[PDB]
């Protein structure tokens, strides 16, 4: 009920979509970062043994657990009308989430690898599915009925798009420079449409 | 309205679309593209990726739908297969996310030479497949009903059947004598939707 605790390990990993949803909805939460050396003793206490996870405690001390980051974000976005106003908007929200998920899948391949292997996979996907999936997302952004990803108000599709673009720029600062104008335009409109999210991203840097 | 499902893999990502329409009692048409035809068909598909759904009205106007699970979620939404409440809606998505992880491991073995396929097959069966199966079994016990979420069919039920069939493709005997909640879910699901049972029986 009352207190929402986000348990995670990666600084800007899958938990970013939970935080950005809560911030855009104006809901408070507490960060609980688990460390590498502590994870062996913490894992048996997490249902499913996987992070990130969400812990909810009420006025009375009863603990409710929530698993699977994007499932958690979908629930919080639904509760605050960030999953489309209609069934047709709901589809378009999920359509962009699915495409963002594919781009995130390619980015994830480079994670937790030795320096030489990480460089090899980065070089491979940047010449591969990353530009192909970026063009697909740009077409989905152009088909919007408003200034944001789906319609004119914030939805979950807006948030996971910001998170995955920051992952792309992590692979290459210059990869989007002078290209993909609809992606640059989406972020500018999104910051202008939610000052709380802009406050969150500005202070995070 | 005519629903055309465009796909290439016999039992790929489109299975969740078919099973949703079958459980809802909505008709559709299978349109399988071939490997040698794909070079000429791809420029006609928005996004250039399959599977995709093509909707034609009574007047001939075409509207396209992309991203299989986004299509399935929309069809399940229109026929009340995404949970009756917001809390049930979360429970459907929790199991879909876990099924998605199991499908992600299965996909690594796909469309590779025989020896490479066997090696990756060995790695995930001794790796994340049993770990993710135990997680799915725990979510099945936590349901308030006989199925995956509640007592009526949801999208979580359908994607679970599809991913379990992919597991048995890796190893016919991997679930033999194990994971009783998974065996019990399928048994309850077939009894709870005769159309789906007809679809799976005739498919074999
Ligand atoms: Na995370
Ligand atoms: Na398919």
Swiss-Prot record, chain A:
Taxonomic classification: Eukaryota, Metazoa, Spiralia, Lophotrochozoa, Platyhelminthes
Span of domain GST C-terminal: 86-205
Cited InterPro entries: Glutathione-S-Trfase_C-like (IPR010987), Glutathione-S-Trfase_C_sf (IPR036282), Glutathione_S-Trfase_N (IPR004045), GST_C (IPR004046), GST_superfamily (IPR050213), Thioredoxin-like_sf (IPR036249)
Organism: Schistosoma bovis
GO annotation terms (biological process): glutathione metabolic process
Segments crossing the lipid bilayer: none
Domain GST N-terminal positions: 2-84
Binding-site residues, glutathione: 8, 14, 39, 43, 51, 68-69, 102
Keywords attached to this entry: Transferase
Name used for this protein in its record: Glutathione S-transferase class-mu 28 kDa isozyme
SUPFAM superfamilies membership: GST C-terminal domain-like, Thioredoxin-like
Pfam families: GST_C, GST_N
UniProtKB/Swiss-Prot annotation, chain B:
Keyword hit for Transferase: yes
UniProt domain GST N-terminal: residue ranges: 1-83
UniProtKB keywords: Transferase
Pfam families linked: GST_C (PF00043), GST_N (PF02798)
Domain of life according to the entry: Eukaryota
GST C-terminal domain segment(s): 85-204
SUPFAM superfamilies: GST C-terminal domain-like (SSF47616), Thioredoxin-like (SSF52833)
GO terms for biological process, alphabetical: glutathione metabolic process
Gene Ontology terms for molecular function: glutathione transferase activity
E.C. number(s) listed in UniProt: 2.5.1.18
Family the entry assigns: Belongs to the GST superfamily. Mu family.
Function field: Conjugation of reduced glutathione to a wide number of exogenous and endogenous hydrophobic electrophiles.
Subunit composition and interactions: Homodimer.
Name the UniProt record assigns to this protein: Glutathione S-transferase class-mu 28 kDa isozyme
Organism this protein belongs to: Schistosoma bovis (Blood fluke)
């Amino acid at each position: 009920g009352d207190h929402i605790k986000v348990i995670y390990f990666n600084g800007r990993g899958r938990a970013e979509s939970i935080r950005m949803t809560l911030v855009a909805a104006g809901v408070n939460y507490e960060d609980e970062r688990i460390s590498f050396q502590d994870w062996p003793k913490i894992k048996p206490t997490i249902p499913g043994g996987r992070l990130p996870a969400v812990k909810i405690t009420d006025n009375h001390g009863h603990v409710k657990w929530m698993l699977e980051s994007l499932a958690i974000a979908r629930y919080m976005a639904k509760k605050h009308h960030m999953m489309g106003e209609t069934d047709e908007e709901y589809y378009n929200v999920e359509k962009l989430i699915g495409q963002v998920e594919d781009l995130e899948h390619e980015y994830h391949k480079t994670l937790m690898k030795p320096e030489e292997e990480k460089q090899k996979i980065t070089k491979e996907i940047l010449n591969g599915k990353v530009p192909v999936l970026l063009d697909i997302i740009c077409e989905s952004l152009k088909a919007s009925t408003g200034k944001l990803a789906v319609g004119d108000k914030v939805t979950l599709a807006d948030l996971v798009l910001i998170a995955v673009i920051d992952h792309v720029t992590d692979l290459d600062k210059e990869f989007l420079t002078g290209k993909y104008p609809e992606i640059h335009k989406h972020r500018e409109n999104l910051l202008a449409s939610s000052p709380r999210l802009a406050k969150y991203l500005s202070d995070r840097a």
